[PDB]
């Protein structure tokens, strides 16, 4: 592989240039606001975001070394996680609000989905208090992509190659922190703090997924979103 030969700075540089853009929603301040209307906008936004995410994944070091079936499985598993951490990243500098889009900044007010909102809010404030750097963020997002579906797939050195790339990203995270002047103790602690947040990310994704294929049976879902949602099939 080529990802295993990348230095830390090369890894960061690769992840940074692979960053997807911030898409706009179709939100209209004049238009009446409500749930389902809001969910309609988020569905439309996520669907377009998914297209950029798929092509972003191809530029993640080590991802194209995987079989096509394995690429599909990882994205099917992690897509909402990746969307959510992007959302949380966008909303860092907006206390008490989630920046779904540059033209869609929402607070808590505008019950089960409310708690998802609060969890996303809490995660965003967590990043803010830690002062998460962009270089750290792109590492975390890449970790999610490779890790979330790594235990849900003979013979496959695929899993082994993924773990080696994951190790490289860990090395990259540590390298960034040491460059920030953090002591060894501070490096390990911050690394732990970041990865623990990924557990909360998974939690929010699972709860979000539940609400998404609950209302699917009832907002229209795009053809791609339905397929991504169908991957999390079980009742």
């Amino acid at each position: 592989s080529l990802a295993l030969s990348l230095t830390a700075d090369q890894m960061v540089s690769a992840l940074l240039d692979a960053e997807p853009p911030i898409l706009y929603s179709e939100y209209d301040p004049t238009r009446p606001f409500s749930e389902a209307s809001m969910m309609g906008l988020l569905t439309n936004l996520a669907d377009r975001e998914l297209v950029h995410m798929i092509n972003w994944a191809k530029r993640v070091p080590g991802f194209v070394d995987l079989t096509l079936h394995d690429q599909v499985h990882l994205l099917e598993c992690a897509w909402l996680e990746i969307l959510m951490i992007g959302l949380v990243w966008r909303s860092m500098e907006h206390p008490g609000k989630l920046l779904f889009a540059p033209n869609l900044l929402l607070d808590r007010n505008q019950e089960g989905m409310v708690e998802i909102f609060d969890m996303l809010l809490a995660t965003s404030s967590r990043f803010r208090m830690m002062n998460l750097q962009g270089e750290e963020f792109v590492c975390l997002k890449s970790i999610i992509l490779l890790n979330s579906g790594v235990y849900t797939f003979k013979s496959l050195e695929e899993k082994d190659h993924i773990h080696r790339v994951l190790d490289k990203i860990t090395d990259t995270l540590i390298h960034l922190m040491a460059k920030a002047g953090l002591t060894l103790q501070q490096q390990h602690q911050r690394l732990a703090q970041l990865l623990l947040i990924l557990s909360h990310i998974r939690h929010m994704s699972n709860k979000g997924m539940e609400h998404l294929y609950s209302m699917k049976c009832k907002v229209p879902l795009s053809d791609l979103l339905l397929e991504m949602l169908d991957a999390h099939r079980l009742h």
Binding site: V51, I54, N55, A57, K58, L68, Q71, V72, L75, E76, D223, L224, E227, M228
Partner: peptide, 11 residues
């Protein structure tokens, strides 16, 4: 097969 499968393929 799937849309995700198609988009991942498109060179």
């Amino acid at each position: 097969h799937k849309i995700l499968h198609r988009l991942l393929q498109d060179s």
